[PDB]
From a paper:
One of the key enzymes within this node is phosphoenolpyruvate carboxykinase (Pck), which catalyzes the interconversion of phosphoenolpyruvate (PEP) and oxaloacetate (OAA) using ATP or GTP as a cofactor and a divalent cation as an activator. [name] Pck is a GTP-dependent enzyme that under standard conditions catalyzes the gluconeogenic reaction leading to production of PEP. However, under reducing conditions, it favors the anaplerotic OAA synthesis.
To explore the [name] GTP binding pocket as a potential site for Pck inhibition, we determined the crystal structures of [name] Pck in complex with GDP and Mn2+ and with GDP. The final dataset was collected to 1.8 Å resolution for Pck-GDP-Mn2+ and to 2.6 Å resolution for Pck-GDP complex, respectively. Additional disordered region is present between residues Ala448-Asn458, forming flexible loop in the Pck-GDP complex. Structures of Pck-GDP-Mn2+ and Pck-GDP complexes are very similar, the Cα root-mean-square deviation (RMSD) is 0.363 Å. The differences bigger than 1Å are located within the N-terminal residues Gly8—Thr11 and in residues Arg81, Gly190, and Glu259. Furthermore, the aromatic residues Phe502, Phe510, and Phe515 form a pocket with three walls and strongly contribute to GDP binding by π-stacking interactions with the guanine base sandwiched between the side chains of Phe502 and Phe515. It should be mentioned here that the conformation and position of GDP and the mutated residues are the same in both crystal structures. Comparison of [name] Pck-GDP and Pck-GDP-Mn2 complex structures indicated that binding of Mn2+ does not influence positioning of GDP in the active site during anaplerotic reactions.
Numbering used by the authors: 8 to 450, 458 to 606
The structure:
């Protein structure tokens, strides 16, 4: 194909050929990450009809893209961990023999890139200055993928450079699975009814076929950053996690970094862009999705965000509820996927301010206030925006040695039973709280271990073991304290006991105070939990009885919880570590 490519990495140069020969594109193109390229690609995408260019008074350099109603997220059921032995995928994952899967996908790939450009998209996960940065190359026939990868990863010339002549990298292959015939006119959003998102842990490879959407197609965002990364983590001494990285800044003038793993729809994005409500506190973000954490030479755990932009859910995002998010998209350079077009070339979505009377919806049809029965924006529609535009981005965001983590937080939605905040008794108890994370639920109480249920690249039980092991072998003075929060406990009339949002900084305050040995906490069966007295309520219009209710550890309710933990633990099967059963036994012993 077109190989006058700017590299002497033979291994790469082979692989590109081998793939081209199988997929039969018209040309191969290597992407460089330049502004100049970005515009070409956006122009080609606007000509194709995939992108609409937004009215540029209102938004610098921003676009709207509408997908086929058939690839719109997801497809965890078409997502596979193809390790050699089935046990090393484990019961949270979909497995298939690797040889059987190669057969299926080599068939699928044969001639799939036909009447289309094959982009070779190199990229770096993590800051770029690192000694041994974690790099990858995504081949894809989708331009939308190229553009989106430019914001979400450090893409192009720089990463290609970091690879040398023989530097290792993750081989990541994508196709939309819609080959053209030589006459044929394309569609705005090519995809297929057949979809596979396949992860090969031992060879550190991702094969994606069939979808052009999100985490099925932008291969760094979950395929690399959690699935392959976690497997790397296992083998190499670190942790790849579904965590926001928050930097909380006290009245003067200390920085505390937190890592928090909530499942999606439970509040990562809010907590990561928290505006504290107590005078003198600031907050800055390093990330709101993925945290890579390693132990420092002395002797702490350091976090880095492997990504380079935000890929947020649009619906419900607004100036009241997330103005930091909003200022970030205002700076433009943004691609909106499946939101609505306003009468004057702007974008809108349910929850945004205004009440436009007419819209063109995400299917391209006319939409009307108090009339059309469907949402104007797709309810999982997205924005894709550079991290560097975020006004509260912490200055250490591009810093390869990371930030020391003081606390690690786990949580989800629980209407009952789980208090607003609980501190772990120790590392091994910490892992068990993570390991047992429950959220209601569905797609009524789902277990979603460290908010990683759909993202583990290997067996859950071994993943827990890995967590225990990194703790056993470290100075417990220097480990992060672990906490378990719940913003969502409800009273008898069904209102929230806790107001949450901004005011969650009160809970973070207690966590800091606890680190600076200056707040109290009762020992309870599930861990240490503050009395209302122990929390800074000054300035808050809320009933102290509500707050104590949020804080209750009720022996009866937790007795009801133990069989659900147990089922879940049985479901984890033969790799369930002793530590976790020990902690389960302990929790049971203290509840009687
Ligand atoms: N009651 C309550 N709801 C919250 C809180 N934080 C987030 N939410 C709700 O959870 C949903 C969005 O959380 P988001 O930050 O988008 O979660 P993410 O999907 O985990 O990033 C919205 O419906 C929010 O209003 C909170 O502290 N209290
Ligand atoms: Mg949930």
């Amino acid at each position: 194909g077109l190989d006058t490519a700017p590299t002497n990495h033979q291994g790469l140069l082979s692989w590109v050929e081998e793939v081209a020969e199988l997929t039969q594109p018209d040309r191969v193109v290597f992407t460089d990450g330049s502004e100049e390229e970005f515009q070409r690609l956006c122009d080609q995408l606007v000509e194709a009809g995939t992108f609409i260019r937004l009215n540029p008074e209102k938004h610098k350099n921003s676009y709207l893209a509408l997908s086929d109603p058939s690839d719109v997220a997801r497809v965890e059921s078409r997502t596979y961990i193809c390790s050699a032995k089935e046990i090393d995928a484990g019961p949270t994952n979909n497995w298939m023999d690797p040889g059987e899967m190669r057969s299926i996908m080599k068939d699928l790939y044969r001639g799939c890139m036909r009447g289309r450009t094959m982009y070779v998209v190199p990229f770096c996960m993590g800051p770029l200055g690192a000694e041994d940065p974690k790099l990858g190359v995504e081949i894809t026939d989708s331009e939308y993928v190229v553009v989106s990868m430019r914001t979400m990863t450090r893409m192009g010339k720089a990463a290609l450079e970091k690879m040398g002549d023989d530097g290792f990298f993750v081989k990541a292959l994508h196709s939309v699975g819609a080959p053209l015939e030589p006459g044929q006119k394309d569609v705005a959003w090519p995809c297929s009814e057949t979809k596979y998102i396949t992860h090969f842990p031992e060879t550190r490879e991702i094969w994606s076929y069939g979808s052009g959407y999100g985490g099925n197609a932008l291969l760094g965002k979950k395929c690399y950053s959690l699935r392959i990364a976690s497997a790397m983590a296992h083998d190499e001494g670190w942790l790849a996690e579904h965590m926001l990285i928050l930097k909380l800044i006290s009245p003067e003038n200390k920085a505390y970094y937190f890592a928090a793993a909530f499942p999606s729809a439970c509040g990562k994005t809010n907590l990561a862009m928290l505006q504290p409500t107590i005078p003198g506190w600031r907050a800055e973000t390093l990330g709101d999705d993925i945290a890579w954490m390693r132990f420092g030479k002395d002797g702490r755990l350091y976090a880095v965000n492997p990504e380079f932009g935000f890929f947020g859910v649009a619906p419900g995002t607004n100036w009241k509820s997330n103005p930091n998010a909003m200022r970030t998209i205002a700076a433009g350079n943004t691609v909106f996927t499946n939101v609505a077009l306003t009468d004057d070339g702007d974008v809108w979505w349910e929850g945004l301010e205004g009440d436009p009377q007419h819209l063109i919806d995400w299917k391209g049809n006319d939409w009307y206030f108090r009339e059309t029965e469907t949402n104007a924006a797709h309810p999982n529609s997205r924005y894709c925006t550079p991290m560097s535009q975020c006004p509260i981005l912490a200055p250490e965001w591009d810093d390869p040695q990371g930030v020391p983590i003081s606390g690690i937080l786990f949580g989800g939605r629980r209407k009952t039973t789980v208090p607003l905040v609980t501190e772990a008794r120790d590392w091994q108890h910490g892992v068990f709280i993570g390991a047992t994370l429950g959220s209601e639920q569905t797609a009524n109480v789902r277990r979603d271990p460290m908010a990683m249920l759909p993202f583990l690249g290997y067996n859950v039980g071994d993943y827990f073991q890995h967590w225990i092991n990194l703790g056993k072998h470290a100075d417990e003075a220097k480990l992060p304290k672990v906490f378990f929060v719940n913003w969502f406990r409800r009273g008898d009339d069904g209102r929230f006991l806790w107001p949450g949002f901004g005011e969650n900084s009160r809970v973070l305050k207690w966590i800091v105070d606890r680190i600076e040995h200056k707040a109290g906490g009762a020992t309870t069966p599930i861990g240490t939990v503050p009395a209302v007295e122990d929390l800074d309520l000054d300035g808050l219009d809320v009933d102290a009885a509500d707050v104590a209710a949020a804080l209750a550890v009720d022996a009866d309710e937790w007795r009801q919880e133990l069989p659900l933990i147990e089922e879940w633990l049985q479901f984890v099967g033969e790799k369930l570590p002793t530590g976790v059963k020990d902690e389960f036994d302990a929790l049971k012993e203290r509840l009687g």
